[PDB]
Design an enzyme around this catalytic site. Structure first.
Site, PDB file in Angstrom:
ATOM      1  N   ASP A   1      87.972  14.541  27.202  1.00  0.00           N
ATOM      2  CA  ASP A   1      86.933  14.776  28.194  1.00  0.00           C
ATOM      3  C   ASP A   1      85.687  13.961  27.889  1.00  0.00           C
ATOM      4  O   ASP A   1      84.565  14.435  28.030  1.00  0.00           O
ATOM      5  CB  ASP A   1      86.592  16.257  28.325  1.00  0.00           C
ATOM      6  CG  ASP A   1      85.749  16.557  29.583  1.00  0.00           C
ATOM      7  OD1 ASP A   1      85.721  15.724  30.524  1.00  0.00           O
ATOM      8  OD2 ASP A   1      85.123  17.643  29.643  1.00  0.00           O
TER       9      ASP A   1
ATOM     10  N   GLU B   1      75.334  30.759  31.626  1.00  0.00           N
ATOM     11  CA  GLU B   1      76.264  29.853  30.961  1.00  0.00           C
ATOM     12  C   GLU B   1      75.695  29.272  29.652  1.00  0.00           C
ATOM     13  O   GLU B   1      76.060  29.734  28.578  1.00  0.00           O
ATOM     14  CB  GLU B   1      76.668  28.728  31.916  1.00  0.00           C
ATOM     15  CG  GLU B   1      78.142  28.394  31.853  1.00  0.00           C
ATOM     16  CD  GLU B   1      78.521  27.232  32.756  1.00  0.00           C
ATOM     17  OE1 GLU B   1      78.249  26.064  32.375  1.00  0.00           O
ATOM     18  OE2 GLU B   1      79.086  27.488  33.849  1.00  0.00           O
ATOM     19  N   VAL B   2      74.816  28.275  29.723  1.00  0.00           N
ATOM     20  CA  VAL B   2      74.242  27.697  28.508  1.00  0.00           C
ATOM     21  C   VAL B   2      72.746  27.952  28.399  1.00  0.00           C
ATOM     22  O   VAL B   2      71.999  27.726  29.347  1.00  0.00           O
ATOM     23  CB  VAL B   2      74.481  26.185  28.432  1.00  0.00           C
ATOM     24  CG1 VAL B   2      73.653  25.579  27.308  1.00  0.00           C
ATOM     25  CG2 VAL B   2      75.944  25.910  28.195  1.00  0.00           C
TER      26      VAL B   2
ATOM     27  N   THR C   1      76.339  28.266  35.753  1.00  0.00           N
ATOM     28  CA  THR C   1      76.364  29.608  36.332  1.00  0.00           C
ATOM     29  C   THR C   1      75.182  30.457  35.832  1.00  0.00           C
ATOM     30  O   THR C   1      74.310  29.951  35.106  1.00  0.00           O
ATOM     31  CB  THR C   1      77.704  30.325  36.016  1.00  0.00           C
ATOM     32  OG1 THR C   1      77.875  30.443  34.596  1.00  0.00           O
ATOM     33  CG2 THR C   1      78.870  29.530  36.585  1.00  0.00           C
TER      34      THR C   1
ATOM     35  N   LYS D   1      76.187  29.034  24.151  1.00  0.00           N
ATOM     36  CA  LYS D   1      77.128  28.698  25.202  1.00  0.00           C
ATOM     37  C   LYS D   1      78.054  29.881  25.374  1.00  0.00           C
ATOM     38  O   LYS D   1      78.875  30.152  24.509  1.00  0.00           O
ATOM     39  CB  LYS D   1      77.927  27.465  24.780  1.00  0.00           C
ATOM     40  CG  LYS D   1      78.674  26.725  25.881  1.00  0.00           C
ATOM     41  CD  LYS D   1      79.691  25.774  25.256  1.00  0.00           C
ATOM     42  CE  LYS D   1      80.712  25.274  26.270  1.00  0.00           C
ATOM     43  NZ  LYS D   1      81.768  24.415  25.657  1.00  0.00           N
TER      44      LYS D   1
ATOM     45  N   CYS E   1      70.458  19.935  20.638  1.00  0.00           N
ATOM     46  CA  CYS E   1      70.244  18.499  20.751  1.00  0.00           C
ATOM     47  C   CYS E   1      69.369  18.306  21.986  1.00  0.00           C
ATOM     48  O   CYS E   1      69.723  18.773  23.084  1.00  0.00           O
ATOM     49  CB  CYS E   1      71.584  17.794  20.949  1.00  0.00           C
ATOM     50  SG  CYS E   1      72.698  17.939  19.540  1.00  0.00           S
TER      51      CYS E   1
ATOM     52  N   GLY F   1      70.481  23.201  32.070  1.00  0.00           N
ATOM     53  CA  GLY F   1      71.262  22.712  33.196  1.00  0.00           C
ATOM     54  C   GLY F   1      71.422  23.682  34.356  1.00  0.00           C
ATOM     55  O   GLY F   1      70.828  24.761  34.369  1.00  0.00           O
TER      56      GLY F   1
HETATM   57  N1  ANP Z   1      74.003  21.648  21.407  1.00  0.00           N
HETATM   58  C1  ANP Z   1      73.483  21.457  22.597  1.00  0.00           C
HETATM   59  N2  ANP Z   1      72.130  21.210  22.732  1.00  0.00           N
HETATM   60  C2  ANP Z   1      71.588  21.012  23.947  1.00  0.00           C
HETATM   61  N3  ANP Z   1      72.242  21.016  25.135  1.00  0.00           N
HETATM   62  C3  ANP Z   1      73.620  21.273  24.962  1.00  0.00           C
HETATM   63  C4  ANP Z   1      74.291  21.494  23.776  1.00  0.00           C
HETATM   64  N4  ANP Z   1      75.637  21.714  23.964  1.00  0.00           N
HETATM   65  C5  ANP Z   1      75.743  21.615  25.245  1.00  0.00           C
HETATM   66  N5  ANP Z   1      74.544  21.341  25.926  1.00  0.00           N
HETATM   67  C6  ANP Z   1      74.283  21.149  27.383  1.00  0.00           C
HETATM   68  O1  ANP Z   1      75.403  21.772  28.120  1.00  0.00           O
HETATM   69  C7  ANP Z   1      76.081  20.731  28.860  1.00  0.00           C
HETATM   70  C8  ANP Z   1      77.374  20.721  28.142  1.00  0.00           C
HETATM   71  O2  ANP Z   1      78.043  21.778  28.303  1.00  0.00           O
HETATM   72  P1  ANP Z   1      79.347  21.657  27.618  1.00  0.00           P
HETATM   73  O3  ANP Z   1      79.159  21.916  26.202  1.00  0.00           O
HETATM   74  O4  ANP Z   1      79.906  20.291  27.788  1.00  0.00           O
HETATM   75  O5  ANP Z   1      80.340  22.755  28.228  1.00  0.00           O
HETATM   76  P2  ANP Z   1      81.094  22.372  29.595  1.00  0.00           P
HETATM   77  O6  ANP Z   1      81.270  23.575  30.343  1.00  0.00           O
HETATM   78  O7  ANP Z   1      82.421  21.858  29.300  1.00  0.00           O
HETATM   79  N6  ANP Z   1      80.264  21.267  30.433  1.00  0.00           N
HETATM   80  P3  ANP Z   1      79.404  21.909  31.659  1.00  0.00           P
HETATM   81  O8  ANP Z   1      80.314  22.280  32.790  1.00  0.00           O
HETATM   82  O9  ANP Z   1      78.429  20.886  32.171  1.00  0.00           O
HETATM   83  O10 ANP Z   1      78.663  23.120  31.187  1.00  0.00           O
HETATM   84  C9  ANP Z   1      75.759  19.391  28.359  1.00  0.00           C
HETATM   85  O11 ANP Z   1      75.953  18.297  29.229  1.00  0.00           O
HETATM   86  C10 ANP Z   1      74.343  19.622  27.796  1.00  0.00           C
HETATM   87  O12 ANP Z   1      73.383  19.286  28.780  1.00  0.00           O
HETATM   88 MG    MG Z   2      80.642  18.999  29.421  1.00  0.00          MG
END
Ligand code: ANP
Ligand code: MG
Ligand code: ZN
Ligand code: ZN
Lengths: 247, 325, 48
Positions: free
Chosen positions: B134, B25-26, B22, B41, B91, B19
């Site tokens: 959420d 971030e992920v 920042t 994450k 995922c 994605g």
């Molecule tokens: N286990 C996973 N496998 C693949 N992608 C993931 C996974 N967990 C999170 N993501 C990706 O990270 C984004 C989700 O981040 P998230 O876990 O919801 O933390 P968030 O900060 O609350 N949301 P965001 O602001 O979009 O990062 C999702 O919409 C996915 O695209």
């Molecule tokens: Mg999210």
């Protein structure tokens, strides 16, 4: 081994991290209860629930089966532990509110450094850093089940008098402060040990359920009369080694 | 310093950024030995004051508690000698992702299957006294094998099953706006499992409409959109809605009639799917359907019966020419 | 030292803070004021 991760043998408790740095057994054992007192102090100052206190202690005890009092003074660690414990048990206190009460207790004499000085800000970080080390040392495992649960539940079940009830709960708070049972037996057994004890003192022999199980069999299935006597004797000897036992 | 229970994130090799968040971030990454695909994450801490975020602590505490076929799985918590990293089982896609890509096709049977997992996952977490707080298409992942997984427990928290005594006071400004139910917009602080079932209702429509059915710009514009869709918020359809402080002090169109099944009639078609979307998007929480009943509603037990997501996942192509040729 | 219903959720648990201030009096009753007075007074344990 995941469930057995924070439970140790009498030998393991002996070969602690504090031991490897020349600290003596009863030396250690004292820091534990000391730390547990400071935690119980600041915690009543900040008015954090009893549960926030008990959890802060279990963090303490486990933190010192991996780390040594040598390197981490139980007075530095205790504030951080309680800080973290607050959030965890949903009654968080502000980092500052805590750096205060922690200072009132370890330095009633002096006065709070200026909330602007280098020393103040400096320590506000030492606390924050410590909480990061406590978190990594406990392996981020934060949920703590306590003896007080199984104690209350059990007394209600045997219709124990108000006095036996309070006394059994009182002994569970102490097993946390005084013994390390928290690191050797599951909460349900420790709860059984606390009821068996408050009962000796009350010379009450809880009736054996109609052609069946003993009271401790409604609290835990691995408990035996033999154990409860050994642990009770073990708890009392600990009580006999406290300082004042040596309006 | 000793740290037997918090491994270095080096065991994992970073492969990509998931994605546009920042800097770090992920991350998509793999275990250097088993090759297991995970998602790293980073626990964010630009706001440092109360030390480790109590919000991060609630996430971890909740994730370590919740283990279910339909709830994202936290493998472990790692560190870099400093940052803390949550490691999950990777995922491949997120529901918001598939829905936007209008080139991906959803059969009726496959949507039934997605809603079933989503609601079975919600039944689980509520059962364990946890509110997601959420829900949206972006926090719902789907693995390459077709299994749905609720994700993002960064705003979750536990709640009390007190039908008994005193009123609870939970943080009120929660849940992304476009999916926030009424009760929360009107100032409700003693809420529960129904705030997630509302969100489950918006995501369900999006299954057909392919995008958020109520894109408010403000809290007042949102309630507006909700009134124009569900009917006006009155004490007749939602008893005692009066009591709310803001009930009065907020503009609130009062002549509106429920048009749910109408406005969606175009997109959805099947009667049972319309009825459910109708019972989920109900103004009064106490009357809004729940996971237990939603799961047993005819939509899931009528032809066509739910099917796996194999087809729907094959419509997701590798690139341009596959998509356009 | 005072029994609290375990059934109550974490945020619903009463503060530990003892109703009355801690006295410096040593005696079976002042030694059993709270959990701090019992640990410190009766068992003679202190952190400083
Ligand atoms: N286990 C996973 N496998 C693949 N992608 C993931 C996974 N967990 C999170 N993501 C990706 O990270 C984004 C989700 O981040 P998230 O876990 O919801 O933390 P968030 O900060 O609350 N949301 P965001 O602001 O979009 O990062 C999702 O919409 C996915 O695209
Ligand atoms: Mg999210
Ligand atoms: Zn006195
Ligand atoms: Zn006292």
């Amino acid at each position: 081994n995941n469930n057995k991760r924070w439970y140790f043998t009498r030998e393991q408790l002996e070969n602690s991290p504090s031991r490897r740095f020349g600290v003596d057994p009863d030396k250690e054992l004292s820091y534990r209860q000391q730390a547990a007192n400071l935690l119980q102090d600041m915690g009543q100052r900040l008015n954090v629930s009893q549960l926030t206190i008990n959890t802060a202690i279990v963090y303490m005890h486990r933190f010192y089966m991996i780390q040594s009092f040598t390197q981490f003074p139980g007075n530095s660690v205790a504030p951080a532990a309680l800080f973290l414990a607050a959030k965890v048990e949903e009654q968080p206190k502000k980092l500052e509110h805590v750096i205060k009460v922690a200072h009132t207790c370890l330095h009633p004499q002096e006065s709070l450094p200026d909330t602007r000085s280098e020393a103040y800000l400096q320590q506000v970080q030492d606390l924050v850093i410590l909480e990061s080390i406590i978190l990594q040392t406990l392996g981020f495992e934060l949920t703590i089940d306590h003896p007080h649960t199984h104690v209350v539940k059990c007394t209600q079940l045997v219709r124990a008098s108000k006095d036996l009830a309070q006394t059994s709960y009182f002994m569970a708070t102490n097993s946390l402060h005084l013994t390390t049972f928290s690191l050797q037996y599951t909460p349900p057994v420790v709860a059984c040990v606390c009821i068996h004890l408050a009962c000796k003192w009350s010379n009450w022999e809880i009736p054996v359920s109609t052609d069946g199980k003993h009271w401790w069999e409604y609290v835990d299935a691995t408990v035996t009369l033999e154990l409860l006597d050994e642990l009770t004797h073990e708890f009392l000897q600990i009580l006999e080694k406290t300082p004042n036992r040596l309006c | 310093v000793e740290c037997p229970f918090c491994d270095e994130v080096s065991k994992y090799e970073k492969l990509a950024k998931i994605g546009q968040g920042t800097f770090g971030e992920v991350f998509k990454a793999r275990h250097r030995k088993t090759g297991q695909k995970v998602a790293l994450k980073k626990v964010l801490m630009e706001n440092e004051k109360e030390g480790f975020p109590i919000t991060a602590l609630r996430e971890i505490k909740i994730l370590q508690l919740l283990k279910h076929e339909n709830v994202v799985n936290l493998i472990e918590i790692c560190r870099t000698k400093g940052s803390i990293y949550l490691v999950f089982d990777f995922c491949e896609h997120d529901l918001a992702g598939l829905l936007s890509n209008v080139l991906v096709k959803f059969t009726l049977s496959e949507i039934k299957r997605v809603m079933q997992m989503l609601l079975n996952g919600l039944y689980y977490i509520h059962r364990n006294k946890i509110l997601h707080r959420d829900m949206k298409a972006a926090n719902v992942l789907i693995t390459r094998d077709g299994v749905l997984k609720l994700a993002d427990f960064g705003l979750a928290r536990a709640f009390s099953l007190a039908k008994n005594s005193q009123p609870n006071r939970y943080t009120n400004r929660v849940v992304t706006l476009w999916y926030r139910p009424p009760e929360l917009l009107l100032g409700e602080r003693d809420y529960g499992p129904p705030i997630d079932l509302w969100g489950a209702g918006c995501i369900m429509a999006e299954m057909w409409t392919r995008s958020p059915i109520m894109q408010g710009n403000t809290e007042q514009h949102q309630l507006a959109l909700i009134s124009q869709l569900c009917g006006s918020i009155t004490p007749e359809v939602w008893p005692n809605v009066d009591n709310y402080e803001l009930y009065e002090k907020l503009e609130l169109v009062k002549g509106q009639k429920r048009k749910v099944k109408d406005r969606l009639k175009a997109y959805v078609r099947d009667p049972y799917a319309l009825d459910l979307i109708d019972k989920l998007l109900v103004l009064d929480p106490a009357q809004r359907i729940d996971s237990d009943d939603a799961l047993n509603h005819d939509f899931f037990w009528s032809d066509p019966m739910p099917s796996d997501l194999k087809g729907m996942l094959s419509t997701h192509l590798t690139s341009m020419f596959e998509y356009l040729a | 030292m005072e029994p609290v219903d375990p059934r109550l959720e974490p945020w619903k648990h009463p503060g530990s803070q003892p109703k009355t201030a801690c006295t410096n009096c040593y005696c079976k009753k002042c030694c059993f004021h709270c959990q701090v007075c019992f640990i410190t007074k009766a068992l003679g344990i202190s952190y400083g």
